[PDB]
Amino acid sequence: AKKILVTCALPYANGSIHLGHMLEHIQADVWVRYQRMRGHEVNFICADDAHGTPIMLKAQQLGITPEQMIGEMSQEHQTDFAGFNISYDNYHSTHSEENRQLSELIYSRLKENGFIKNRTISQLYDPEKGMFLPDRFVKGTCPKCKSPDQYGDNCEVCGATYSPTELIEPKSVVSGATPVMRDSEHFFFDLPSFSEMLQAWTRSGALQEQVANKMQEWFESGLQQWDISRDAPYFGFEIPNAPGKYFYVWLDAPIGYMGSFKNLCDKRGDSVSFDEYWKKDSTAELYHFIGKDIIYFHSLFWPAMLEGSNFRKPSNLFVHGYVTVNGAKMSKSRGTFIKASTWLNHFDADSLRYYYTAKLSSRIDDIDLNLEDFVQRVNADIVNKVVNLASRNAGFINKRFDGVLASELADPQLYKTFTDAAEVIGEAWESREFGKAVREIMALADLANRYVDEQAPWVVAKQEGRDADLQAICSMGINLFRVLMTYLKPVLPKLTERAEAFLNTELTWDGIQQPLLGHKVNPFKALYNRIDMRQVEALVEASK
Ligand SMILES: [Zn+2]
């Protein structure tokens, strides 16, 4: 009955999708698929974050327009996400008319409401190229240790940090020219005016405890005003009434959440849903799945901007930790910085979806992809626990019973044990306690395989006169498989499709209450094959 709008953070347009992005998009997709299974109206919304100085400069380096470059990367990203079955209702771009109109609208309301301040700043400027330089486009000699060729605000030899204005013999990374200090008028969002409102959000109990604790540190330090403008030359949207000034990504990137939804509504010819979801009086739910590095933005700047422009605020923020591989941050030299596209050359999507889901929880702790454990766990749980219930039983049904399952459950009390677990498992999906859900599902899978072992169909099948017993045993196992695959349907979309083809039925959450009786199933080739460490080694080699 609920109306739910769910986002993931917008991938930056100047890098390929990697396993860190995939943790976030898979986590959100599992949640979204569960919510759809429970009958809710769900809109899963994302987009590429496509503006700014690094994008402008990279396109100039490539000798193509920024529009061409971001279009190519948007296609690459969407191809990768589609390969992992991320079920967006719309994937748009911050470089869009919807985002331009919403950025202009929000800015105009913030300004009319007194929340935009003008301030003159001083920044390093490349007088040959004719542009202000972000810190990382200034290089020079470390003032402390005198090491040459250091970039931005820190030295990678001695570890010192300093303003780039302290670098010795500074050079523009863009042109090689010596930069100079130049003043410019910038426009700032008066975030400190929302401090009391934001403090009340933190105490409310909606947010992850770990997230609320971080916000307390930020209130202690004191909220600052945030620059929302950039000078030309820029790739982005110009500020009304301010020639030569553009919206900085702080302002336009999250508006892409709104612009992507507006695009979806407009393409559908739906003239009511945008306001229904984003007006202050909305009864729809708004959730953002994000990582640890963007908590401050989404918990402080973003709700303040929405409040100040007369829009509703997020219902909650769902924050996850970082991905590690083999216990450490992804490492290019070790081949553990793994692209989504590369992953799919070696493994299917369901394997990684399962592995991350088995590790995920409602906390912000990091998620480790241990590659040895990945092989062991996929083979143990998918191949040998869940799919085994179908593969060990379906042959007898197809070959000796014309594909027809028994007319009654052999063990109705065991079946009820499995259906009774739906409440706790669904609550675990709902609360983002994914690891708890998987543990419960796999405990049931162990109980199902225990049942089959106890009945010993490989013995019954060779014994004269026991056809009916064999059909009963094997049909019971297949019905337990039906239930387990329903619980795993948010996690394993492709395996689920194969299971539905075998079972001749769509799997629905409520459908488990009606077992398959006197019901024709289909033959299948392997539903899921084993993986091995040779494939892991190949993936690692390919990623170096
Ligand atoms: Zn140094």
Side-chain angles (χ1 to χ4, degrees), residues 104-315:
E104 293 184 7
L105 174 67
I106 286 164
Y107 175 78
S108 82
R109 288 179 180 180
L110 294 177
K111 189 170 179 59
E112 172 161 358
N113 289 340
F115 300 124
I116 298 296
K117 307 306 171 181
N118 294 5
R119 206 221 308 293
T120 291
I121 60 83
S122 185
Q123 180 179 354
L124 285 166
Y125 176 82
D126 181 336
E128 177 182 321
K129 179 63 171 179
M131 73 184 284
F132 285 98
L133 289 176
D135 288 356
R136 63 188 204 77
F137 294 97
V138 182
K139 65 176 185 172
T141 293
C142 173
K144 310 298 172 45
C145 78
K146 313 299 190 296
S147 285
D149 304 311
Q150 297 308 308
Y151 291 71
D153 70 4
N154 64 95
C155 176
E156 294 182 5
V157 181
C158 73
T161 62
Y162 39 78
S163 173
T165 60
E166 304 179 40
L167 284 163
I168 291 169
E169 293 301 290
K171 311 297 182 188
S172 172
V173 170
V174 175
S175 68
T178 298
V180 299
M181 295 308 284
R182 182 183 189 94
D183 285 355
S184 179
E185 181 177 58
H186 281 227
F187 311 143
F188 291 73
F189 175 52
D190 190 23
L191 176 63
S193 284
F194 298 83
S195 294
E196 299 194 28
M197 184 275 280
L198 295 166
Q199 291 181 67
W201 197 31
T202 310
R203 299 186 288 259
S204 71
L207 291 171
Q208 283 156 298
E209 149 193 315
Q210 286 164 300
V211 173
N213 292 344
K214 284 178 183 297
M215 289 161 85
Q216 290 304 342
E217 309 168 345
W218 292 325
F219 297 125
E220 304 278 348
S221 305
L223 303 189
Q224 68 174 81
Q225 299 182 342
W226 287 101
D227 192 353
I228 54 73
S229 67
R230 286 290 183 271
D231 291 277
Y234 203 72
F235 180 58
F237 296 146
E238 216 162 16
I239 300 184
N241 304 305
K245 309 288 182 178
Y246 288 76
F247 293 117
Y248 184 46
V249 286
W250 287 144
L251 187 142
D252 87 17
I255 299 180
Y257 294 141
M258 303 172 81
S260 184
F261 192 62
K262 184 174 187 307
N263 176 252
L264 177 58
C265 293
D266 293 346
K267 283 194 299 197
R268 290 173 169 169
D270 175 344
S271 61
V272 297
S273 289
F274 184 88
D275 290 349
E276 289 184 349
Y277 277 76
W278 290 96
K279 70 187 171 177
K280 269 175 84 162
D281 45 320
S282 177
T283 57
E285 307 172 17
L286 173 60
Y287 300 113
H288 303 302
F289 282 91
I290 61 174
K292 280 195 294 207
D293 283 344
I294 61 183
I295 295 169
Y296 184 118
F297 183 85
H298 284 83
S299 67
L300 299 172
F301 179 101
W302 177 230
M305 170 205 277
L306 291 164
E307 171 105 325
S309 57
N310 210 37
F311 289 100
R312 57 85 55 76
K313 289 169 294 212
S315 302

